[PDB]
Amino acid sequence: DLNRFDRDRLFNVVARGNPEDLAGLLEYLRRTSKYLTDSEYTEGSTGKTCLMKAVLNLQDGVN
Protein backbone atom coordinates (compact mmCIF):
# COMPACT_ATOMS: atom_id res chain seq x y z
CA ASP A 1 0.00 0.00 0.00
CA LEU A 2 1.35 3.40 1.00
CA ASN A 3 4.02 2.22 3.45
CA ARG A 4 5.52 -1.03 2.10
CA PHE A 5 4.98 -3.71 -0.56
CA ASP A 6 7.51 -6.55 -0.52
CA ARG A 7 8.39 -8.92 -3.37
CA ASP A 8 7.22 -12.04 -1.53
CA ARG A 9 3.68 -10.78 -1.02
CA LEU A 10 3.53 -9.80 -4.70
CA PHE A 11 4.58 -13.25 -5.89
CA ASN A 12 2.09 -14.93 -3.55
CA VAL A 13 -0.71 -12.56 -4.62
CA VAL A 14 -0.20 -13.14 -8.34
CA ALA A 15 0.16 -16.89 -7.74
CA ARG A 16 -3.11 -17.02 -5.80
CA GLY A 17 -4.94 -15.30 -8.66
CA ASN A 18 -6.94 -12.67 -6.76
CA PRO A 19 -6.61 -9.14 -8.19
CA GLU A 20 -8.22 -7.43 -5.18
CA ASP A 21 -5.01 -8.06 -3.21
CA LEU A 22 -3.14 -5.89 -5.75
CA ALA A 23 -4.70 -2.84 -4.09
CA GLY A 24 -2.24 -0.15 -3.06
CA LEU A 25 0.66 -1.21 -5.29
CA LEU A 26 0.27 1.80 -7.60
CA GLU A 27 0.41 4.25 -4.69
CA TYR A 28 3.57 2.55 -3.43
CA LEU A 29 5.21 2.71 -6.84
CA ARG A 30 4.32 6.39 -7.21
CA ARG A 31 5.59 7.25 -3.72
CA THR A 32 8.83 5.26 -3.70
CA SER A 33 9.42 5.75 -7.46
CA LYS A 34 10.14 2.07 -8.14
CA TYR A 35 9.32 -0.06 -11.18
CA LEU A 36 8.36 -3.72 -11.36
CA THR A 37 11.48 -4.50 -13.43
CA ASP A 38 13.81 -3.19 -10.73
CA SER A 39 16.22 -5.49 -8.91
CA GLU A 40 13.93 -5.66 -5.86
CA TYR A 41 10.96 -7.08 -7.81
CA THR A 42 13.00 -9.57 -9.86
CA GLU A 43 14.20 -12.99 -8.73
CA GLY A 44 17.75 -11.68 -8.44
CA SER A 45 19.28 -14.88 -9.82
CA THR A 46 17.47 -15.65 -13.08
CA GLY A 47 15.64 -12.36 -13.73
CA LYS A 48 12.12 -13.76 -13.24
CA THR A 49 9.45 -11.06 -13.12
CA CYS A 50 6.11 -10.89 -11.34
CA LEU A 51 4.45 -11.16 -14.75
CA MET A 52 6.30 -14.44 -15.38
CA LYS A 53 5.16 -15.70 -11.98
CA ALA A 54 1.60 -14.70 -12.87
CA VAL A 55 1.68 -16.53 -16.21
CA LEU A 56 3.32 -19.66 -14.75
CA ASN A 57 0.40 -20.08 -12.32
CA LEU A 58 -2.68 -20.31 -14.55
CA GLN A 59 -5.82 -21.73 -12.95
CA ASP A 60 -7.80 -21.53 -16.20
CA GLY A 61 -6.71 -20.17 -19.58
CA VAL A 62 -6.49 -16.75 -17.90
CA ASN A 63 -5.01 -15.22 -14.75
What is the C-alpha to C-alpha distance for residues 55 and 19, in angstroms, rounded to an integer? 14
DSSP-derived 3-state class of residue 31: helix
The data reach a resolution, in angstroms, of 3.9
DSSP sequence for 32-49: HT--TTSSSSS-SSS---
49 with 42: CB under 8 angstroms?
Answer: yes
Nearest alpha-carbon partner for 54 in 38, 36, 40: 36
